[PDB]
Ligand binder design. Structure first.
Ligand SMILES: COc1ccc(C(C)=O)cc1CSc1nnc(C)n1Cc1ccccc1
Ligand SMILES: [Mn+2]
Ligand SMILES: [Mn+2]
Lengths: 556, 401
C-alpha cells in the first residue's frame, strides 16, 4: 500500500427550513430489480455506496434503463427532488472560454480524469439525504437500503465540488511547473505548453504521477484523444479553430420554435463567418410565441438568406492569440442598423468576427450605433483577451470631434484610427447656435382636437408668408412635427424656425438621422437639404409674437 | 479582539452580484494584493459551498501609482441589518475640511464568523480560463456600511484626546474616510491635521482639501443688455417662465407684449418702460431664497448633471422638484467626457457627504452602456453612489447655462 492522499470534504447543507427528500420507490419489474442488485453490489465493494438501515427516513427513487444497442441495464437515481432542496453552490463555468483567446502553444494533450468522479468523498453529514431503495422481488421483504459515499451522478453539487477538488489537487503542480497551462472541463484536463514534444510528454508523465498521489488513474499515451478537439460546438486544430458544421433545417413550412433554433445557429456561425445577417429572419418572431405556426418571407429576406446558405459553403477559420502582437478591431456599417466587425492581429488572419444590431427605439443615428458597437467589442475583448483593442472605424476624426463636443450627452470611444472603407459614418445636418441674419423666420404651430382627431398645422413668417393645412386622423404631437416640416419645405436654404413644441425639440435635439416615424424622416430629409437651420423654442399660450398669431390659426 | 453579532435584513439573502470583466493588469494587481492579504489573515480562500458574490475591481487612488482594491459592496450594504452617528451640521459651515483615509484600521478587527460568507468576492480569470479565485473576508472590509458602525466604539476612544485638546475641530466619519473641519487659516489647518495623524500611527498618508462655496444655491441670473433682439427676448421669456415654477411672482406679460407681431429673430426690439420694470422686479424676486426648502433625512437626495461643453458641468441637488438644496458648476482631460463626468460625480458625492452625511442618487447625461463600460477606469473614491441614466435631452440645460 503506497499511501494515497485523502481528498478534502466540502461541507454541504440543505436549503434553510427545508428537509431531505421522501419520494416513493415505484414498482419495478423482477428483471429490473435483479439488475439493480448486481450494480449496487459492485459499487459497494468499490466503496461508492454502503448499506443503511430503517433509521434513515429519506428516500430517492431508483430506475433502470437499458443502454441502447446494449443488453446491459444501467442504474439511474432520480435526484430531481433532493436537488430542489440542496443548497446553492458557486456554479461551474460563469462563461464559456472563446477559442480566439487561446494563446499560441506548441503542444496540447488531453487527459481523461473520468475515473475520479467517484473518487471524491461526499460530506459525511450529507450522505443521509442520498438514500435510495431497491424494491424487493414481489414486495415481500424490506427493500435494500443504500446511501452514497461519493458525489452521485446527477446530484446538484457534484460538478462544482468535483472541479474545486481538482483545482486544489492541481495547484501545487501548476506552481511547481509555471511553464504548464491546464484547463479542466468536466472529466477532461487540457494540458498545454510551449515545450518541444519530448519535454512536453515528460511533463505530462509527471502530472500523471502527481494525480496518482490521490489515486487518480489517467489514460496513457496510446489512449489519449487527438486533435481536432470537438468542444462546446468548436473544432480546435493545432494552429486554427472553427465552429462545428452548422446544419440547417430544410422545411418549406416553418414554425416559430425552429426559427428560434436557427437564428441562434446563424448567430453561432457569425463569430467566424463574415456577413451573417439575421435581421429579416428575426423580425418574423415579433411578439408571437406559439411555437407551431407558419409564415412565409419577403423579397429581401431570401436575398439575405440566399447568401446565408451560400456563406456557409466554404469553411473559414480563426487563428489563435499572440500576446506580443497588437489587437486590432475593425467595424463596417452594413446598413439597416446592422454592423459587422473583425478582430485580428495580422491582416486577413482573423481571431474572430461578429455582428451588432441597433437597440430598439424610435429615433437613432449612425454615430450612436457605432459608439454602442465599440462598447460591445470593448467588453467582449476584455473578457477574451484581457485588453481593449485598437479600433479602425469608418468615421473621420473631424466628424467624431464635432459630434462629441456638441452632443448633449457625455460620450467616449477608446483609441482608434480612421479607415476609409465606405459607407462612412457622418453627421447629416448640424443646427445653428445663433439666429441667422437675413433668413426668413417661420413661426410654426399645430393643434388637434382629441375627440375628432382633426387638426391643423401651419406657419406665419416675418415676410408675410403663411400656410395652414387641415389634417385628419392626427394628434397634437403629429401636428407640431407637420408644422415644422411645412416650414422646412417652404423656406430657402437658410431658415429660422420658432416652435412651442417641447416634443419636437426633444426629438430634433437628439439628432436622429433615421426614424421609425415617416414624419420625422421627412423632416430629417429636409434638414439634410438645408444649408442653415436655427431652431428656437418658446413657451406656449404666453402671447409670444408670431407664435400667438399662428396659434389662433391652427387651434380653430 | 472579539466579534460583534451581525445579521442581514429579514427575508433577504446574501448578495449574488456578477463580477464584471477586468483587464489583465487589474487582475494581476488584485492577485498580488489579495495574496498578501491572505498571508496577513485578512481574507481566506473559500470553496464551492459559498454561492455569494460581490464585484471587485482595482483603482489608482488620487495622487498615487500603486493599485488599490475596491469592493462594490452596494448590494450587501442594501441587504445588511441597519446598525443603530448624528451627522454634525457644523461641518458644512467650517472654512476648510480635510478628508483622511482611515480604512486600514478596519483590518485589525475581526468579522463575525457567521457573516463572513456574505463578503465573498471573485478575482476573475481572462477568457474564463479557470474559475475565479474566490475569497471571503475575516476582518471588517473597506466599503461595507457595517465597518464604520462596528468600529465606531473604538474610533471614538482614539479621537477623544484630540477632540478635547481642540474643541473647535469638527470630525465626521463616513465609510473609510474621516472629515476634519475647522475655521483656522489654511497654514494652521495643515499643521493640526498632521497632528491628527499621530493616532493611527500610535493606536493614511494623503489628505483632501475642501472649502464651501459662496452660494448653497446659485442665483438665477438674467442678462443685462442695452439692445434686445427678438431672439434675446424669446430666450428671456422662456427662462422666466421656467423660473416661475420655482419663484412665485415672476411675470412675463409686459415682456411678451414686446413680442407682438411676426418679427425676424434678429430684429432689435426697444424695451418699453413697463417691460423694463417687469424685468427689474423679476431680478429682485430672483435674489431671494426659494420658499419652503428643507432637508428631510427620510427622503433620498437626487443629483442631476448637465454637460455644458468646454469642460463645464452644472448640477443641482434636491429632494422635491424645483426645491433645490444645492446647485453648482464643475469645470476643468480636455478630451474625455466620461472622465470628466466621473470626477464631477465624485466631487458632488463628497459635497453631499459633508452637508447631509449621505450620498445622492444621480441622473447622469450618458447612455448606460457607455458609462458602465468606462467609469471604473477613472474612479478614485472608496464609496460608490447610485445612478440612473437620462436618454432625452432636457430643455433645462439652457436655464443653467
Ligand atoms: C477544448 O480545448 C481547450 C479549451 C480551452 C482551453 C483553455 C481555456 O485553455 C484549452 C483547450 C485545449 S486546445 C488549445 N489550447 N491552446 C491552444 C492554442 N489550443 C489549440 C490546440 C489544439 C490542438 C493542439 C494544439 C493546440
Ligand atoms: Mn403648439
Ligand atoms: Mn399651440
Amino acid at each position: 500500500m503506497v499511501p494515497i492522499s485523502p481528498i478534502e470534504t466540502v461541507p454541504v447543507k440543505l436549503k434553510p427550513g427545508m428537509d431531505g427528500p421522501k419520494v416513493k420507490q415505484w414498482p419495478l419489474t423482477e428483471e429490473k430489480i435483479k439488475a439493480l442488485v448486481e450494480i449496487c453490489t459492485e459499487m459497494e465493494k468499490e466503496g461508492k455506496i454502503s448499506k443503511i438501515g430503517p433509521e434513515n427516513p429519506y428516500n430517492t427513487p431508483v430506475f433502470a434503463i437499458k443502454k441502447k444497442d446494449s443488453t446491459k441495464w444501467r442504474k439511474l437515481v432520480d435526484f430531481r427532488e433532493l436537488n430542489k432542496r440542496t443548497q446553492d453552490f458557486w456554479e461551474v463555468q460563469l462563461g464559456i472560454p472563446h477559442p480566439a483567446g487561446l494563446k499560441k502553444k506548441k503542444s496540447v494533450t488531453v487527459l481523461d480524469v473520468g475515473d475520479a468522479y467517484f473518487s471524491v468523498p461526499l460530506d459525511e453529514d450529507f450522505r443521509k439525504y442520498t438514500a435510495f431503495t431497491i424494491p424487493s422481488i414481489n414486495n415481500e421483504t424490506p427493500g435494500i437500503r443504500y446511501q452514497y459515499n461519493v458525489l452521485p451522478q446527477g446530484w446538484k453539487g457534484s460538478p462544482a465540488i468535483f472541479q474545486s477538488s481538482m483545482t486544489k489537487i492541481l495547484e501545487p503542480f501548476k506552481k511547481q511547473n509555471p511553464d504548464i497551462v491546464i484547463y479542466q472541463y468536466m472529466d477532461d484536463l487540457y494540458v498545454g505548453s510551449d515545450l518541444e514534444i519530448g519535454q512536453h510528454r515528460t511533463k505530462i508523465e509527471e502530472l500523471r504521477q502527481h494525480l496518482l498521489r490521490w489515486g487518480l488513474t489517467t489514460p496513457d499515451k496510446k489512449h489519449q484523444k487527438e486533435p481536432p478537439f470537438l468542444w462546446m460546438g468548436y473544432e480546435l486544430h493545432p494552429d486554427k479553430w472553427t465552429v462545428q458544421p452548422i446544419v440547417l433545417p430544410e422545411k418549406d413550412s416553418w414554425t416559430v420554435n425552429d426559427i428560434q433554433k436557427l437564428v441562434g445557429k446563424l448567430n453561432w456561425a457569425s463569430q467566424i463567418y463574415p456577413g451573417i445577417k439575421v435581421r429579416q429572419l428575426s423580425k418574423l418572431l415579433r411578439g408571437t410565441k406559439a411555437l407551431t405556426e407558419v409564415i412565409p418571407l419577403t423579397e429581401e429576406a431570401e436575398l439575405e438568406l440566399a447568401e446565408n446558405r451560400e456563406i456557409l459553403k466554404e469553411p473559414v477559420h480563426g487563428v489563435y492569440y499572440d500576446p506580443s502582437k497588437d489587437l486590432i478591431a475593425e467595424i463596417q456599417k452594413q446598413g439597416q442598423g446592422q454592423w459587422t466587425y473583425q478582430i485580428y492581429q495580422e491582416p486577413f488572419k482573423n481571431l474572430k468576427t461578429g455582428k451588432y444590431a441597433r437597440m430598439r427605439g424610435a429615433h437613432t443615428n449612425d454615430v450612436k450605433q457605432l459608439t454602442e458597437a465599440v462598447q460591445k467589442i470593448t467588453t467582449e475583448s476584455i473578457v477574451i483577451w484581457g485588453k481593449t483593442p485598437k479600433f479602425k472605424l469608418p468615421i473621420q476624426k473631424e466628424t467624431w470631434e464635432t459630434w462629441w463636443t456638441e452632443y448633449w450627452q457625455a460620450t467616449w470611444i477608446p483609441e482608434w484610427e480612421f479607415v476609409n472603407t465606405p459607407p462612412l459614418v457622418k453627421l447629416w445636418y448640424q443646427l445653428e447656435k445663433e439666429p441667422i441674419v437675413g433668413a426668413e423666420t417661420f413661426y410654426v404651430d399645430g393643434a388637434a382636437n382629441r375627440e375628432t382627431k382633426l387638426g391643423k398645422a401651419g406657419y406665419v413668417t416675418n415676410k408675410g408668408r403663411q400656410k395652414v393645412v387641415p389634417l385628419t386622423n392626427t394628434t397634437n404631437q403629429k401636428t407640431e412635427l407637420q408644422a415644422i416640416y411645412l416650414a422646412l419645405q417652404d423656406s430657402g436654404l437658410e431658415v429660422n424656425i420658432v416652435t412651442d413644441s417641447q416634443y419636437a425639440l426633444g426629438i430634433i435635439q437628439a439628432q436622429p438621422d433615421k426614424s421609425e416615424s415617416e414624419l420625422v424622416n421627412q423632416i430629417i430629409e429636409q434638414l439634410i437639404k438645408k444649408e442653415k437651420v436655427y431652431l428656437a423654442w418658446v413657451p406656449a399660450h404666453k402671447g409670444i409674437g408670431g407664435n400667438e398669431q399662428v396659434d389662433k390659426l391652427v387651434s380653430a | 479582539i472579539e466579534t460583534v453579532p451581525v445579521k442581514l435584513k429579514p427575508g433577504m439573502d446574501g448578495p449574488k452580484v456578477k463580477q464584471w470583466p477586468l483587464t489583465e493588469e487589474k487582475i494581476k494587481a488584485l492577485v498580488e494584493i489579495c495574496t498578501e492579504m491572505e498571508k496577513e489573515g485578512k481574507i481566506s480562500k473559500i470553496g464551492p459551498e459559498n454561492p455569494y458574490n460581490t464585484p471587485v475591481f482595482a483603482i489608482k487612488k488620487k495622487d498615487s501609482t500603486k493599485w488599490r482594491k475596491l469592493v462594490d459592496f452596494r448590494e450587501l450594504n442594501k441587504r445588511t441589518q441597519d446598525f443603530w452617528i448624528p451627522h454634525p451640521a457644523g461641518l458644512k459651515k467650517k472654512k476648510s475640511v480635510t478628508v483622511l483615509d482611515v480604512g486600514d484600521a478596519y483590518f485589525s478587527v475581526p468579522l463575525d464568523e457567521d457573516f463572513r460568507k456574505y463578503t465573498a468576492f471573485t478575482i476573475p480569470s481572462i477568457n474564463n480560463e479557470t474559475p475565479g479565485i474566490r475569497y471571503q473576508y475575516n476582518v471588517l472590509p473597506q466599503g461595507w456600511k457595517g465597518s464604520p458602525a462596528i468600529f465606531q466604539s473604538s474610533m471614538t476612544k482614539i479621537l477623544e484626546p484630540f477632540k478635547k485638546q481642540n474643541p473647535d475641530i469638527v470630525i465626521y466619519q463616513y465609510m473609510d474616510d474621516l472629515y476634519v473641519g475647522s475655521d483656522l487659516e489654511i497654514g494652521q489647518h495643515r499643521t493640526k491635521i498632521e497632528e491628527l495623524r499621530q493616532h493611527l500611527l500610535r493606536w493614511l498618508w494623503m489628505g483632501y482639501e475642501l472649502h464651501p462655496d459662496k452660494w448653497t444655491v446659485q442665483p438665477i441670473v438674467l442678462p443685462e443688455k442695452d439692445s434686445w433682439t427678438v431672439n434675446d427676448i424669446q430666450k428671456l421669456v422662456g427662462k422666466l417662465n421656467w423660473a416661475s415654477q420655482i419663484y412665485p411672482g415672476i411675470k412675463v406679460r409686459q415682456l411678451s407684449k414686446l413680442l407682438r407681431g411676426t418679427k425676424a429673430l434678429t430684429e432689435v426690439i426697444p424695451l418699453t418702460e413697463e417691460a423694463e420694470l417687469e424685468l427689474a422686479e423679476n431680478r429682485e424676486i430672483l435674489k431671494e431664497p426659494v420658499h419652503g426648502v428643507y432637508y428631510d433625512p427620510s427622503k433620498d437626495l437626487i443629483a442631476e448633471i448637465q454637460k455644458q461643453g468646454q469642460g463645464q458641468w452644472t448640477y443641482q441637488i434636491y429632494q422635491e422638484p424645483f426645491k433645490n438644496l444645492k446647485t453648482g458648476k464643475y469645470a476643468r482631460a480636455h478630451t474625455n467626457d466620461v472622465k470628466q463626468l466621473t470626477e464631477a460625480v465624485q466631487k458632488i458625492t463628497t459635497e453631499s457627504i459633508v452637508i447631509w452625511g449621505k450620498t445622492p442618487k444621480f441622473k447622469l447625461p450618458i447612455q448606460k452602456e457607455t458609462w458602465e463600460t468606462w467609469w471604473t477606469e477613472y474612479w478614485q473614491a472608496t464609496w460608490i453612489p447610485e445612478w440612473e441614466f437620462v436618454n432625452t435631452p432636457p430643455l433645462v440645460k439652457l436655464w443653467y447655462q
